[PDB]
From a paper:
Cellulosomes are sophisticated multi-enzymatic nanomachines produced by anaerobes to effectively deconstruct plant structural carbohydrates. Cellulosome assembly involves the binding of enzyme-borne dockerins (Doc) to repeated cohesin (Coh) modules located in a non-catalytic scaffoldin. R. flavefaciens Docs have been organized into six groups based on primary structure homology. This classification was recently found to be functionally relevant, with the binding of group 1 Docs to the Cohs of scaffoldins ScaA and ScaB providing the major mechanism for cellulosome assembly in R. flavefaciens. The data revealed that group 1 Docs display a conserved mechanism of Coh recognition involving a single-binding mode.
In those studies, highly stable complexes were formed between RfCohScaB3 and a group 1a Doc, RfDoc1a, and between RfCohScaA and a group 1b Doc, RfDoc1b. RfDoc1a is a component of a family 12 carbohydrate esterase, and RfDoc1b is the C-terminal component of a family 9 glycoside hydrolase. The structure of RfCohScaA-Doc1b was also solved by molecular replacement using RfCohScaB3-Doc1a as the search model. Like RfCohScaB3-Doc1a it includes a single copy of the heterodimer in the asymmetric unit, 325 water molecules and 2 calcium ions coordinated by the Doc. RfCohScaA-Doc1b is virtually identical to RfCohScaB3-Doc1a and includes residues 3–143 from RfCohScaA and residues 24–102 from RfDoc1b. Significantly, the structures of the RfCohScaB3-Doc1a and RfCohScaA-Doc1b complexes were found to be very similar to each other, with an average rmsd of 0.6 Å for the two chains. The two Docs are less conserved at the C-terminus of helix-1 and this generates differences in the interaction with the Coh. Thus, RfDoc1a establishes an extra hydrogen bond between Tyr-55 Oη (Phe-55 in RfDoc1b) and Oδ2 of RfCohScaB3 Glu-84. In addition, the longer loop connecting helices 1 and 2 in RfDoc1b allows the carbonyl of His-63 to form a hydrogen bond with Asn-124 Nδ2 of RfCohScaA. In addition, the side chains of Leu-87/Leu-95 of RfDoc1a/RfDoc1b occupy the hydrophobic pocket created by Gly-73/Gly-74, Ile-71/Ile-72 and the aliphatic portion of Met-66/Met-67 of RfCohScaB3/RfCohScaA Cohs. The closer proximity of the two protein partners at the C-terminus of helix-3 in RfCohScaB3-Doc1a protein complex allows the formation of two extra hydrogen bonds between RfDoc1a and RfCohScaB3 that are absent in RfCohScaA-Doc1b.
Author numbering:
A (entry chain A): 3 to 143
B (entry chain B): 24 to 102
The structure:
């Protein structure tokens, strides 16, 4: 069990046919709280692949650094004076997913991996977070 | 003397908050720089620890980017 999280990510839900590409837009509800940075890694159920992570975090109008080799992304979400930003309702992350044409009918998850850090300030303090949805239904299981 | 490479906020770990404090010091030095008025301004020790890119040139945007690269395993260490 975990308490009601400070910040909630929503990966969305999707339906696809085997062979299709899926754009996964992740939004965030910070409950009107400002966030200074994020540092995360993603994960996805085999045999689906995250092919690319967009370098824009539209929710913060900021640029993310990425490393597809670890499905990682991070950014600092500060205004031009250094103050942490409250995200908009736009996607915080965009993932470009391939559903191979060999994929069996089923429901496949996309979400975070073993690291998802949402920072409050400049001192290592972090919000609690959770993620919802991220179900990709492939065919008619 | 550096206590921990990348530890710009002197909390004993290297994480994305270290990139934040560098960016804040650069964006608003009167608030967040070495002589800043905010309680969480960067410290002298933090500026030494944070000088991970081109060590010797002090704190620039590229120091924050280097911390991000390290966190992403794009580079193996800091410096
Ligand atoms: Ca969940
Ligand atoms: Ca630190
Ligand atoms: Ca430097």
């Amino acid at each position: 069990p975990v308490a009601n999280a400070d910040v909630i990510f929503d990966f969305g839900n999707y339906e696809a046919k085997a062979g299709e590409e899926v754009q996964v837009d992740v939004t965030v509800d910070s409950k009107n709280k400002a966030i200074s940075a994020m540092d995360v890694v993603f994960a996805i159920d085999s045999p689906l692949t995250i092919d690319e992570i967009d370098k824009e975090s539209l929710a913060f109008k900021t640029t993310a650094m990425t490393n597809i080799a670890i499905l990682g992304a991070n950014f600092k979400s500060l205004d031009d004076k250094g103050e942490p930003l409250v995200p908009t309702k736009d996607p915080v992350f965009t993932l470009y997913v391939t559903v191979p044409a060999t994929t069996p009918d089923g429901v496949y998850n996309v979400g975070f991996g073993n690291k998802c850090e949402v920072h409050k300030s400049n001192d290592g303090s972090k919000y609690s977070s959770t993620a919802i949805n991220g179900k990709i239904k492939v065919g008619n299981p | 003397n550096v206590t921990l490479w990348g530890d710009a906020n002197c909390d004993g770990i290297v994480d994305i908050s270290d990139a934040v404090i560098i960016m804040q010091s650069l964006s608003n030095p009167s608030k967040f720089g070495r002589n800043g008025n905010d309680e969480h301004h960067i410290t002298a020790q933090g500026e030494l620890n944070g000088d991970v890119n081109e060590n010797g040139n002090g704190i620039t945007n590229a120091d924050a980017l280097a911390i991000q690269k390290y966190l992403l395993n794009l580079i193996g260490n800091l410096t």
